Amino acid sequence: IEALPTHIKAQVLAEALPWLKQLHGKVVVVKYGGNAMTDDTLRRAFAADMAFLRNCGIHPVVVHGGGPQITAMLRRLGIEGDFKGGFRVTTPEVLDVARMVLFGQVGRELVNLINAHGPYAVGITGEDAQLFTAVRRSVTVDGVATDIGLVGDVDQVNTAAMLDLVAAGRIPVVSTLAPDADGVVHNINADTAAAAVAEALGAEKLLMLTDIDGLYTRWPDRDSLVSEIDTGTLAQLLPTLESGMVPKVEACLRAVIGGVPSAHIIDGRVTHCVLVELFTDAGTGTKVVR
Amino acid sequence: IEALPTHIKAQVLAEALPWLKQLHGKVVVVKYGGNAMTDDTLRRAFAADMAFLRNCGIHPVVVHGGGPQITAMLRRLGIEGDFKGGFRVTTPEVLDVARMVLFGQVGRELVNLINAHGPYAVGITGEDAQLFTAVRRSVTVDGVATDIGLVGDVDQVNTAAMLDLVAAGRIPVVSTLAPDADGVVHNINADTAAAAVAEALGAEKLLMLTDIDGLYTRWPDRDSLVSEIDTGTLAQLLPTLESGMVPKVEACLRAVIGGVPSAHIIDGRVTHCVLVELFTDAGTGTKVVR
Amino acid sequence: IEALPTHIKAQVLAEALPWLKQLHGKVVVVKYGGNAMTDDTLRRAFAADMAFLRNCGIHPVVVHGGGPQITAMLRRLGIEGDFKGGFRVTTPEVLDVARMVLFGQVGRELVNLINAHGPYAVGITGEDAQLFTAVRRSVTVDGVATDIGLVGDVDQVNTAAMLDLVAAGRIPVVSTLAPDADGVVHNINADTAAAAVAEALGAEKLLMLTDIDGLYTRWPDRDSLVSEIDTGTLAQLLPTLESGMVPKVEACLRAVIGGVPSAHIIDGRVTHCVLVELFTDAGTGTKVVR
Amino acid sequence: IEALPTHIKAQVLAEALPWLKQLHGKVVVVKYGGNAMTDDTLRRAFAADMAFLRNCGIHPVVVHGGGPQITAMLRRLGIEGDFKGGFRVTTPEVLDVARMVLFGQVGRELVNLINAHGPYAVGITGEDAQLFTAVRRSVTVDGVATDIGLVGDVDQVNTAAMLDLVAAGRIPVVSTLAPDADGVVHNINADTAAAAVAEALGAEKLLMLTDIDGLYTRWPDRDSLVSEIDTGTLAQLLPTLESGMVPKVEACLRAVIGGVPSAHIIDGRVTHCVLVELFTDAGTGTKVVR
Amino acid sequence: IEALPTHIKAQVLAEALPWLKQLHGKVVVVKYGGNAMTDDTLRRAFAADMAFLRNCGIHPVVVHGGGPQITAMLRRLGIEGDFKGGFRVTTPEVLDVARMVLFGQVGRELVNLINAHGPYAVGITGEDAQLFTAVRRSVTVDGVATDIGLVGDVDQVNTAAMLDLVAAGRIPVVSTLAPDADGVVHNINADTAAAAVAEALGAEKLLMLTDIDGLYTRWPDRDSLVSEIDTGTLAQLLPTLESGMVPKVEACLRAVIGGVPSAHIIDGRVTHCVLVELFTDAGTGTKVVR
Amino acid sequence: IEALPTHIKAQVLAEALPWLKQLHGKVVVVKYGGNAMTDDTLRRAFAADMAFLRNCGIHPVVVHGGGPQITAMLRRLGIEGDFKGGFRVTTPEVLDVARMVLFGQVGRELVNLINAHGPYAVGITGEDAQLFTAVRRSVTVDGVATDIGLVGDVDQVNTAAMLDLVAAGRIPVVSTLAPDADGVVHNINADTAAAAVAEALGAEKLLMLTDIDGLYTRWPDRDSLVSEIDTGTLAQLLPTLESGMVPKVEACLRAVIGGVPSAHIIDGRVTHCVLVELFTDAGTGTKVVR
Ligand SMILES: COc1ccc2[nH]cc(CC#N)c2c1
Ligand SMILES: COc1ccc2[nH]cc(CC#N)c2c1
């Protein structure tokens, strides 16, 4: 990268100014998952990008999944799954394992990676300082609403306490597990939790790290890819998308309808995707507005 | 407990005043382990006692072990141990498991128990916000100093950041794992870590929850039990005590020599031991001064 | 009190937790009078109980009477009383004496007693920093409303300035004398003033130290005594009670109707009554709610 | 005062600027006694002058005596005096009376007078919030040091707590009674206490209201009067002055040696003396420096 | 001024108290121009008067004109004027000169004069920290509304940022030039700007330094001069006054209608006019209320 | 700039992180002059670069010259110069013009340019709030020290007040004129003033905008250009450099000897030079250390 003239190194920097000003002093919630989380080079760049934001006076908040890791640990422990539709029933035993893996393993990697750049990252769940609570969610399989155990949605968020942490110059790394109103800890889908914290905290943007270029109208036509779309005409598209796409899209809808100015679905496989989406116009993602 | 006259209910309350005043606004570090951690009734009372302290304007800081739990999980995972002397070699694989169990399991139970009383408890390791670092410790077996993997002592403690958390009305529940200077996470003996945070934070007292009445001069003579002892004549006794006793006693020495006014070894098997040691003279523990 | 097993010393302490949490950070106004004020052992315990509250992070505010002391000083000075019904006409001369005795004698004893435990207690009247004002009250004798001099009710209270003092960790000891709108100092009935500060400050509880077990429905049937009663059915009882009882009861009504959660009439003759009423269920008092 | 041209009304105002700047944000301790305290017109002007200072952002602190009032009350109460030399033995009974008169009568008049201008004045003794302590003083009669009861000197002053009160925009009116180290309240000579608070608080000036023009070298030569004098050559004069003069002069010495820039002895019989001494060069007083 | 008895030096000082209290902690906007700005003795006294206010804890804000100075510099530069009616067309070239003279010359004199008394004065325009903006004003000549270049009225005022400066103990010296919404700097009539800042800042008073005794009903009858007048009956007089008088009077109307308690037109030729108007009843000015 | 792949737009951004972290929360003093000040495209980019820094939470402080502009205005005014050696004698008349041009013209352009990006820029001299003072400097011509009027060096700097302005999120644009100890305003060489504020404020870096590539050892050998040099071996070179170079180099020496970590001489003719020097390694400048 040394053979690039110094006068264009300058212009790409200067073209970040309007987004630097837009984002200065603002909350940005980032849901992190996919291959940006399993490849060492992508995950290092993500950590560095969160340190970037922080050394700009932007306030990143990180929400992480970990689905495959939970599966692998359950298998190492020889815990037999029960399945309704294609969901695993989260028994008390499976919650324990899930909590142990998300907060004790996956979140620790990200904290330590970010903290190679400074004393920034701090891991939390809904359990810590009652930062947020959960309500038992139910799922519908082949038409009928069914219970699949200790799985919930984010209920309410201690907005104030949360915003103090970011003000101290700290980056919350959020494992999505939280008590219900009786203290019973539930596991929350990370895409959903991200949307819910973003709306609670009054975030400026919600970034979705996903394993695709962006939202395709009529997959797999290459002509279908989109830069930007509103909630109205997005929700009208929701019933068509592939199974894996629904969660990333419903979170974008819940967030932007919730008042977040824009939610973004960007390519977690691109190294430094967070930087390209926030500080350049060459975004491969797709932006969502009302 | 209803058949006790109301005029003696009053006196036992009034006799807490001199310790309430002594402890108001002060840091108390509590190392929690043993049966006060595995029996539901004792562990609930401990949680309630930490909420007590906090609703008095005292600042409890909780440091927890978890030795047996780590063993059990390693066995469930079929991870083969390597042993020098009688210590397990903490490989990278064993650290991961240890971190996962201490922070993702054992610390979560205590956080949720305390948080039945309010939004108080918050789990941390040395990794979070770089709250403290570790230095690789070595051990001596049958005379020779030997390496037993990623096991360390607390190196340095972010005293300021730590004291802000307690000031926000929060109870840190500390899992004793911390980066070394190269970011490599080590597991720290919980008795040692407790002594080290206590000295760093300028704690007023260090409480040691242990599975005994107190320190016996010449075990097992019942006539040997002691109420109070200084560092000088305690250190002269250290080479005699049973293997399990050394860590609880060396931490008391490192802490009180470090400037902590008094370290206490109290009976974790007594329900509400923390209350009896802090607010009554009927302590079964043994106090340590210089 | 040493022959009581250490495991019950613990339980009576632990049973204070729910009231400690309820009262942490809250204002409690205590009207102090009667024999809890003239016996050295009771008055010392009261002082110690106010230091207790303060070393729990509770905010006590003390309002005191002094009726008998004023009488005695007037008699020592040979000041002749004028009496309408059974009230003394508070002339300018009698106000001076009253102020001198309440603020210069009775309030000083309590300040010095409390301040044996720390730099806590601070004496004030309505005159100091204009903390509250008075409006000339009139009385009805044998049916007709009559003037009995410079006697008033609390008019308005500098709520903000008052709440700063408690925040500095100080215990206001309030002598109930205050300017009217023309600067003319009036003497205010202490039971009434207590109710009025309690409502102004948003106190959590109002404690009434009185010389009885509690409120009797149909005195002197022992079967008449009550633990708890609301304002509606209390006010319906007011026209029956003994002359001395009216002031303690009307203050409870004005306070709980004013929004104070509960007012209490407790036995000032019991040593440490404040402790038993606040931190035990063995209360001899009687609680008042709406 | 209306027949004075408006162009000289202006100049006398403008000539206050250098003292306004010198005194802005500074502590000025004023000992108030004498006829400036017994004549209604002088005492009203003094009150108004303290409100002046405060509405300039200067920090007045008022210390008051009351010797004659104590005598009169003791006589009304028929309390027999015991006298060694010409001092009254302050028995426990005489302390009580003294405290009652100084704090409950004399200090109340001044508080209410000042508070005709705003919520400024606040009465205190050493007892309140432990603002200062006393040490038992002894006196020498006809050569021998003799005990004359509960009379002391100011020992130590809670400088910080005191300076917070002035910062809240409050004027402390100080009755000079304070606990000794065992809680035993003593009466302190007001001239002495004034010097001691002035030095503790780092006052800019100490003002002494006295019943004379100023310090005369060789009284009663009119040619003897002085504008200014240092400590060295003042102390050399101390053994000559009239009995009543010693206390006003020793306080000036203890204060200016203590580091207070200048102590002043001014004419309490002049209406608005405080204003003339602080904001004009036409001072009748006498200034003291090192 | 030394031959004036010290007892009347005192009374004129004491008669400032009610205005000192009224103005303590309040904003006073002063428009400064005329001969109080060109004579060295008057301008020094004005500077000293602003230091007076500040060393009383009053918050002066200074707005200055400079019409004649701009003319003189334009003439020295040989810049030819264009005139519609009797107004100069402010071209880009004339703005530059105006800004250069007002902010770089006239405002510097006043800053340095005030700052002989302390680190008080600070020069600003609407350009600095976007403290206020301008909207292009038009004028009506012989009946028709006409453009006369880059001349505007104060549009909106950064009230908060402005009030922080005064709180730091600083005196803003305001040159009345400000950007429009496109960044194009305009020159604002100083009388108008003064009224607009006064209303924005919630000033207690607006002082107008002008070259006259006060507002005459039917000039030049000496019997016409007035002490006080409301907005209603003032506005009904506006169409009659001399050309130079309109701006001083319309600003008084815009300010007092805007909520400022009183605007004053005082005699800038009297040395220390600000002092006489604020702290004496011998005002030659004329006060305006609703 | 659109034809550049998005994966290299990312890398140049990511390579700013180590300088972003180094500079976060730090003071950077920038001396601005030369063609970066007279060409519209360069001066706009400079303004934008100062907004960049500010929207990163870096604290820029701008010091500006204006030599040629002063000359031009003096010539337009027909003010005859007096010259000793090749310096103009700054008479009172020339100071006035200099102040008027620097603060009223040159500084206004930069303030308005920066303030197109937000309410950031604020113009000051040493006169405002006494932010810094000057001491009359003398010059040596052909060997002899000679007076050339009201020209000085920065004497002392109100470090605290200055650092508050930057903390409020404001960018001081400094015209280098300041009072001496008698209030007599002097003109200060801008290169010198920049070095002096940088050292006073504890700046992290001093940036020098100059019209060259960088410091040449033996000009004009192209082989002479340097990236980095310490003070020792730089000072040994000072006696050789071209006349225009001395001021830029002596300021670098006074600053880095004064404790500033690094001073930089960079190419004001490169658009966005500030960005390239601070956030890229492709610097054309030359860095100075001890
Ligand atoms: C109050 O909310 C929380 C929750 C978890 C936390 N971990 C570390 C900190 C503070 C630091 N450094 C913290 C705060
Ligand atoms: C502002 O209200 C008051 C009234 C009386 C007081 N006495 C002592 C203090 C403060 C201390 N320590 C105080 C404050």
Ligand SMILES: COc1ccc2[nH]cc(CC#N)c2c1
């Ligand atoms: C924030 O608004 C402004 C505008 C101009 C200023 N000049 C000097 C200061 C602060 C100081 N000392 C200042 C503040």
